Write a structure and sequence with these properties.
The structure is cut from a larger assembly and holds 2 copies of chain A (about 70 residues). With about 70 residues, chain A is of the alpha+beta class. Chain A contains 1 helix and 2 strands; from the N terminus they run αββ. The complex binds a molecule of 5 linked components (NAG-NAG-YZT-MAN-MAN) (3 copies) and a molecule of 4 linked components (NAG-NAG-YZT-MAN). Chains A, B: This is DUF4352 domain-containing protein.
Chain lengths: ~70, ~70
Amino acid sequence: LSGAIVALILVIAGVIIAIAVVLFAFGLIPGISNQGSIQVLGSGTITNSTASGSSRTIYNITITVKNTGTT
Amino acid sequence: LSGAIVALILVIAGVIIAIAVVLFAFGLIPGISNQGSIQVLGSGTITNSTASGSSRTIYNITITVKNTGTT
Ligand SMILES: *[C@@H]1O[C@H](CO)[C@@H](O[C@@H]2O[C@H](CO[C@H]3O[C@H](CO)[C@@H](O)[C@H](O)[C@@H]3O)[C@@H](O[C@H]3O[C@H](CO)[C@@H](O)[C@H](O)[C@@H]3O)[C@H](O[C@@H]3O[C@H](CS(=O)(=O)O)[C@@H](O)[C@H](O)[C@H]3O)[C@H]2NC(C)=O)[C@H](O)[C@H]1NC(C)=O
Ligand SMILES: *[C@@H]1O[C@H](CO)[C@@H](O[C@@H]2O[C@H](CO[C@H]3O[C@H](CO)[C@@H](O)[C@H](O)[C@@H]3O)[C@@H](O[C@H]3O[C@H](CO)[C@@H](O)[C@H](O)[C@@H]3O)[C@H](O[C@@H]3O[C@H](CS(=O)(=O)O)[C@@H](O)[C@H](O)[C@H]3O)[C@H]2NC(C)=O)[C@H](O)[C@H]1NC(C)=O
Ligand SMILES: *[C@@H]1O[C@H](CO)[C@@H](O[C@@H]2O[C@H](CO[C@H]3O[C@H](CO)[C@@H](O)[C@H](O)[C@@H]3O)[C@@H](O[C@H]3O[C@H](CO)[C@@H](O)[C@H](O)[C@@H]3O)[C@H](O[C@@H]3O[C@H](CS(=O)(=O)O)[C@@H](O)[C@H](O)[C@H]3O)[C@H]2NC(C)=O)[C@H](O)[C@H]1NC(C)=O
Ligand SMILES: *[C@@H]1O[C@H](CO)[C@@H](O[C@@H]2O[C@H](CO[C@H]3O[C@H](CO)[C@@H](O)[C@H](O)[C@@H]3O)[C@@H](O)[C@H](O[C@@H]3O[C@H](CS(=O)(=O)O)[C@@H](O)[C@H](O)[C@H]3O)[C@H]2NC(C)=O)[C@H](O)[C@H]1NC(C)=O
């Protein structure tokens, strides 16, 4: 008797998990769009920024950046 | 005589108890078999709900949900 009862449970669970994975694949798609939100325009400039006698070398960097995302 | 009457009682009792268990197995099917589920549609969002330098951070999970079951 036992075998058929187990088969019925695993059939119904199989449908539920399979549908969930298909919906997840469609649910990813919006998140792919954000990967291209930025671009860098023209040359930038580096400048030596560290104070006299200081241990750390530090540089100032300046660039033009355009954001086209929603955040 | 005794042996055959006892043999007959245990045949009839065997039929009764076996059929009772078969009827029990058919009685499980409505509980274990149950189509439909909650389905999650598209992307959801997280938003910061935390305020006023509070001790616990709280977030907001908005998502679209479809209950295909009967409950
Ligand atoms: C960014 O700016 C820093 C200063 O704001 C620079 O630090 C100064 O570096 C001088 C030499 O730079 C050369 O050597 C570096 C390694 O030591 C190298 O990383 C650099 O790319 C570059 O090739 C240094 O001069 C000292 O060393 C010279 C020989 O390398 C020597 O000729 C000098 O007399 C001096 O001993 C500076 O040290 C300071 O020099 C003062 C005098 S003067 O050099 O200003 O005329 C002196 O009074 C002081 O005691 C001494 O420490 C050093 N610091 C300063 C304040 O100038 C850093 O290199 C820059 N980095 C880049 C990439 O440009
Ligand atoms: C590297 O980047 C640093 C920031 O990341 C720069 O620090 C900023 O310096 C500004 C002045 O720099 C000028 O003078 C230097 C000699 O002192 C020279 O080496 C530089 O090349 C440059 O010619 C400073 O601006 C001050 O002066 C402005 C007028 O010119 C005035 O409008 C400002 O209000 C300010 O008084 C920056 O200011 C600081 O500004 C803060 C606001 S914001 O400017 O960041 O928007 C303000 O909150 C703060 O109180 C004030 O002190 C100063 N910025 C910072 C963050 O320190 C540094 O100059 C860069 N180095 C080079 C070589 O370009
Ligand atoms: C969601 O909102 C939350 C509440 O505004 C944010 O949690 C708070 O973050 C503050 C610092 O923010 C930055 O650094 C984070 C890493 O530490 C980073 O995740 C963030 O994206 C952001 O870049 C934090 O301020 C504390 O830390 C600062 C240094 O990072 C410091 O300057 C502050 O003085 C302070 O210590 C908040 O912490 C709480 O600050 C209270 C004072 S005030 O900041 O409100 O003025 C202080 O009284 C309290 O004891 C201390 O815990 C912190 N809040 C909490 C509850 O943890 C969170 O970053 C936001 N984003 C995400 C993705 O969760
Ligand atoms: C997370 O989700 C909760 C609801 O579960 C939501 O609470 C609701 O908040 C709005 C106002 O929110 C705005 O201000 C807060 C700061 O206070 C910001 O963090 C938010 O980003 C918003 O800018 C309230 O207007 C809601 O009202 C209560 O509204 C009820 C009706 S409801 O349909 O809005 O639920 C009324 O019945 C009540 O009388 C009234 O007090 C409030 N709703 C609830 C149920 O709490 C948070 O704002 C959400 N957080 C974020 C960050 O969005």
